[PDB]
Amino acid sequence: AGDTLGLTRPNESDAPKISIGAKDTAVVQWQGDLLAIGATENDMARDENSKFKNPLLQQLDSELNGLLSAASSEEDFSGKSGQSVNLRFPGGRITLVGLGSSASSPTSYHSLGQAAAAAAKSSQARNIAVALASTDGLSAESKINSASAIATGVVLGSFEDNRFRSESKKSTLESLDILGLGTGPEIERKIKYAEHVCAGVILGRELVNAPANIVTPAVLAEEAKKIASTYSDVISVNILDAEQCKELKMGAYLAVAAAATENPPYFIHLCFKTPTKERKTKLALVGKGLTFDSGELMKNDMGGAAAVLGAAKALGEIRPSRVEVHFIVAACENMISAEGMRPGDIVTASNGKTIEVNNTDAEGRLTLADALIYACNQGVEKIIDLATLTGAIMVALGPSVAGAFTPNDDLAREVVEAAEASGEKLWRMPMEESYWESMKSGVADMINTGPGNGGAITGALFLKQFVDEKVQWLHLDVAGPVWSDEKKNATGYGVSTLVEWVLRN
């Protein structure tokens, strides 16, 4: 760690790959450390004698001589969302997990998986199983989708980032058997898909969790190269250095980067494409990549870049045809030094527009200006950018819901549908044109920061100045959901939605 500030050396991530499979084993006959069962409120109904009506629960309780029904009533478990009962008995352990009533997939089944991972961690389980108390009326396909969402919840719920702390226990969880939901090639493909996405989500969490003295712009570029190296027959990489970006006239990006002489900036360009020669839709994913932003209360730095690189990691495995995807991150750290940009400075973006920098706490959007111009210059048809852009969007939508801004109603609809499929939370917000007048400069084409009221909107209107009108473009302000204050950890928010969006194109 000789050249790392603070001499910090990340511990080697020693997480096992969980072995996940869908089995036809009867639930009452399954043997291992922990069985988790997802039950709705209706699944917990009892008869005249206070016995479970549900066949699976009735049988498990019988075999336990009424210990499961007794514990459940004593502990007031009736299958409400978030509730759980944990029962250790001779030969095994059962946890019932409440699904509530009328809970949406995939989110309910993600939660179920998360709860199963938590109960595994708290009992040092190695081999676990998950099932639903009832699958009546469900198609083979809904069941497949529930299985893959359960898998996702277990994998993401088992992740623990211990790279920067001296005391930790490695995860005990080695296998997951998903029961009752089908077997064979199709359900296994879907589980594999989920696993590919999770590996992207987990990369995103790691990139964000890591502090700026570890994930520098040069380190972020190396992560990009590692993805390309792993998937070199479908992903290529081009890393531009400051001098190359200067030749491309990226004055807004380079001005933000100028202070940080010790950790130089790198402009990251990955391109995914299968070598086959059918028609491909050309897409870009642009992520804000300030590895530190001068403007540890805000632990969301780089969430956007992380979601973009996480998506690349997923897509490298999934290998969709019919799409060409450009992943673009203008990476730098925003520091303070004699070589730095001052408030009031006027910088020129690579499309010639001039920006009066009235607020040095909003420098991220400057880097995005040049990244968006670059994306448009790759000849893409559609762009999504993700950025932790404003506090204002968290005032508006809270910690958990990202704001989506687009001139293009169709692309809004695509992104809303992708989020519905992934389970991620977002909400379209208006690009109210009248607010652009508040962004006028008395010397330059525009200022970089408008009034507090409307701030997430004028942030979006700012970015629009750097997007070719013929390209469809949506901006996702993810300041809130990239970081979980409760878990004190990154989420990798965005990856799953982006993957779904690419795949549905």
Going by the annotation, the residues of the binding site for Mg(2+) are 288, 293, 301, 361, 363
Kindly tell me which residue out of 62, 175, 358, 505 binds its own copies, with binding defined by CB under 8 A: 358
Determine if 373 is a binding residue for its own copies (CB under 8 A).
no
| 304 touches, from Cl ion, its own copies, Mg ion, none (C-beta below 5 to 8 Å by class) | Cl ion
Residues 50-109 binding Mg ion (CB under 5 A) are: 75
| 388 touches, from its own copies, Cl ion, Mg ion, none (C-beta below 5 to 8 Å by class) | Cl ion
Q: Could you give the 3-state DSSP secondary structure of residue 271?
A: strand
CB 238 within 8 A of CB 326: no
Buried b or exposed e, range 298-320, using 16+ CB within 10 angstroms: ebbbbbbbbbbbbbbbbbbbbeb
For Mg ion, the closer of residues 191 and 283 by Cβ is: 191
Gyration radius from the chain CA atoms:
25
Determine if 388 is a binding residue for Cl ion (CB under 5 A).
yes
Kindly tell me which residue out of 122, 281, 359, 453 binds Mg ion, with binding defined by CB under 5 A: 122
Residues 423-482 binding Cl ion (CB under 5 A) are: 428
| 104 touches, from Cl ion, Mg ion, its own copies, none (C-beta below 5 to 8 Å by class) | none
Kindly tell me which residue out of 101, 102, 105, 124 binds its own copies, with binding defined by CB under 8 A: 124
> Can you tell me the distance from the alpha carbon of 246 to that of 210, in angstroms, rounded to the nearest whole number?
29
Residues 205-234 binding its own copies (CB under 8 A) are: 209, 211-214
For its own copies, the closer of residues 242 and 503 by Cβ is: 242
Determine if 347 is a binding residue for its own copies (CB under 8 A).
yes
Q: Could you give the 3-state DSSP secondary structure of residue 218?
A: helix
Q: Provide the pairing of β-strand 92-100 with 382-387.
A: unpaired
CB 499 within 8 A of CB 324: no
Closest distance of CB 368 from Mg ion, Å = 18
Which residue is listed with tokens 């965005």? 494
For Mg ion, the closer of residues 187 and 328 by Cβ is: 187
Determine if 8 is a binding residue for Mg ion (CB under 5 A).
no
> Can you tell me the distance from the alpha carbon of 338 to that of 15, in angstroms, rounded to the nearest whole number?
43
Determine if 20 is a binding residue for Mg ion (CB under 5 A).
yes
For its own copies, the closer of residues 9 and 504 by Cβ is: 9
DSSP state of 46: B
- Interface stretch with Cl ion, choices 161-169, 283-291, 346-354, 394-402 (CB under 5 A): 283-291
Which residues, in sequence order, are bridge partners of residue 46?
Answer: 52
Closest distance of CB 488 from its own copies, Å = 3
Determine if 470 is a binding residue for its own copies (CB under 8 A).
no
CA of 390: how far to CAs of 332, 365, 459, in Å? Answer: 18, 10, 8
Write out the binding residues. Answer: 288, 293, 301, 361, 363
| 20 touches, from its own copies, Mg ion, Cl ion, none (C-beta below 5 to 8 Å by class) | Mg ion
| 303 touches, from Mg ion, Cl ion, its own copies, none (C-beta below 5 to 8 Å by class) | Cl ion
For the sheet containing 19-23, what is the strand order? 19-23, 175-179, 127-132, 34-40, 92-100, 84-89
For Mg ion, the closer of residues 277 and 487 by Cβ is: 487
Closest CA to 256 of 329, 360, 387: 360
For Cl ion, the closer of residues 339 and 409 by Cβ is: 409
Q: What are phi and psi of 424, to 5 degrees?
A: -80, 150
Kindly tell me which residue out of 113, 265, 303, 480 binds Cl ion, with binding defined by CB under 5 A: 303
Determine if 164 is a binding residue for its own copies (CB under 8 A).
yes
> Can you tell me the distance from the alpha carbon of 475 to that of 493, in angstroms, rounded to the nearest whole number?
15
Which residues touch 278 (CB under 8 Å, ≥6 apart)?
A: 321, 322
For its own copies, the closer of residues 55 and 82 by Cβ is: 82
Which residues touch 217 (CB under 8 Å, ≥6 apart)?
A: 263, 264, 265, 266, 289, 291, 331, 332, 333
Kindly tell me which residue out of 63, 241, 339, 410 binds its own copies, with binding defined by CB under 8 A: 339
Closest CA to 20 of 177, 158, 187: 177
CB 134 within 8 A of CB 56: yes
Residues 378-417 binding its own copies (CB under 8 A) are: 392-401
Determine if 274 is a binding residue for its own copies (CB under 8 A).
no
Amino acid at 318: I
> Can you tell me the distance from the alpha carbon of 51 to that of 57, in angstroms, rounded to the nearest whole number?
9
| 364 touches, from Cl ion, its own copies, Mg ion, none (C-beta below 5 to 8 Å by class) | Cl ion
Determine if 71 is a binding residue for its own copies (CB under 8 A).
yes
Would you tell me which residues interact with Mg ion (CB under 5 A)? 20-21, 75, 122, 208
